[PDB]
């Protein structure tokens, strides 16, 4: 199917408690494969998936060089952004950056990404053309001018169309037994009486990978979008994910309700009901 | 592999 690679950078200032912390993590789809933390006893890029362990010392050294450089650069950037917003030196602030490449089912580049936020709010983003920027405000306009002078968009385009895709395809091959294996959800419906004439039907999906899943309840063939409690998809801790959808139903009407499950790992989409 | 500047 479709695949993506993403790096997520978080840089966090902390006045009075040392220099800003820099954390970087890398993902292929819903699988983390690397980490770096400037707060570690001996900061170095570390493997987080078995299939990345085969990469040579030069890979790990180059990664560590990049993230150590970024640690220093983002500390300067935090100082810069504090100034752009006329903020005091006393407050803690966060820059986040998210970048990477999407591949279609055939393996070609679908699109590239490079987006930044400041204190949880969108700040600047590389446009889909990989040539121009969208700045959120007059502060981000300063950043835009800097990056246009340093030809950052051009450098990112070269990476996103080239090395990003090349490395992603390599990881997909090296980790094919997991990264290119969709695990279907194990599904069941539970029944929980709440009163004499109302009961909760909960539709469970367990042990699935990747995280993308559709879980809906239907009453007489009609979607119960407003009446359904749908929890956030959550990690099991073994690479797989869990989700449930619940609806409060009148007693004796349970068979009018159907749960519908859509996921990549299923040979066919599932229709489920409560089995007394 | 990550890409190899200030805001």
């Amino acid at each position: 199917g479709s695949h993506s690679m993403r790096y997520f950078y978080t840089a966090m200032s902390r006045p009075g408690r040392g220099e800003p912390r820099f954390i970087a993590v890398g993902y292929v789809d819903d699988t983390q494969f690397v980490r770096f933390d400037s707060d570690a006893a001996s900061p170095r890029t570390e493997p987080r998936a078995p299939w990345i362990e085969q990469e040579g010392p030069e890979y790990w050294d180059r990664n560590t060089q990049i993230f150590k450089t970024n640690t220093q650069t983002y500390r300067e950037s935090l100082r810069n952004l504090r100034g752009y917003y006329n903020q005091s030196e006393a407050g803690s602030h966060i820059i986040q950056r998210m970048y990477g490449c999407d591949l279609g089912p055939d393996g070609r580049l679908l699109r590239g990404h490079d987006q930044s936020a400041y204190d949880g709010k969108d700040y600047i983003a590389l446009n889909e053309d990989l040539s121009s920027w969208t700045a959120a405000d007059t502060a981000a306009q300063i950043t835009q001018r800097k990056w246009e002078a340093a030809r950052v968009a051009e450098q990112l385009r070269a990476y996103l169309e080239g090395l990003c895709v090349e490395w992603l395809r390599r990881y997909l091959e090296n980790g094919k037994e997991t990264l290119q294996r969709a695990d279907p959800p194990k599904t069941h419906v539970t029944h929980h009486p709440v009163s004499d004439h109302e009961a909760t039907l909960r539709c469970w999906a367990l042990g699935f990978y990747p995280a993308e899943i559709t879980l809906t309840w239907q009453r007489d063939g009609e979607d119960q979008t407003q009446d359904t409690e749908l929890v956030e998809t959550r990690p099991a801790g073994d690479r797989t994910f869990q989700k449930w959808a619940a609806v409060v139903v009148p007693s004796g009407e349970e068979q009018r309700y159907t749960c519908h499950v859509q996921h990549e790992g299923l040979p066919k989409p599932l229709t489920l009901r409560w089995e007394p | 592999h990550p890409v190899g500047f200030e805001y």
């Binding site: 986040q96 998210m98 956030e232 | -």
Partner: protein, 99 residues
């Protein structure tokens, strides 16, 4: 602005009394990233709790998984204690095997 954490407390595998399992506390949708998470056994803090590396969602909100090995019983109560700048008091979410 700031965003308060969502909290889910659950097991890795279906809960069976006397069988080893993993106790998960998933915190998500929060901002800023600083967060205090402890797993509790009968009110007492479990020592060797591990957590995932800091990452974030498309809306920039952070998520973390805190986890420890545990053996569920009929009597033992488990919970997750979460503190964040958005909360005036640490929030307790009890573990429910049906949730």
């Amino acid at each position: 602005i700031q965003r308060t954490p969502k909290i889910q407390v659950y097991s890795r595998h279906p809960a069976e009394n006397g069988k080893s399992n993993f106790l998960n506390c998933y915190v998500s949708g929060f901002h800023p990233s600083d967060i205090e998470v402890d797993l509790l056994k009968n009110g007492e803090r479990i020592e060797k709790v591990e957590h995932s590396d800091l990452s974030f969602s498309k809306d920039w909100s952070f998520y973390l998984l805190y986890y420890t090995e545990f053996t569920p019983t009929e009597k033992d109560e488990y919970a997750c204690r979460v503190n964040h700048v958005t909360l005036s008091q640490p929030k307790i979410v009890k573990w429910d095997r049906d949730m």
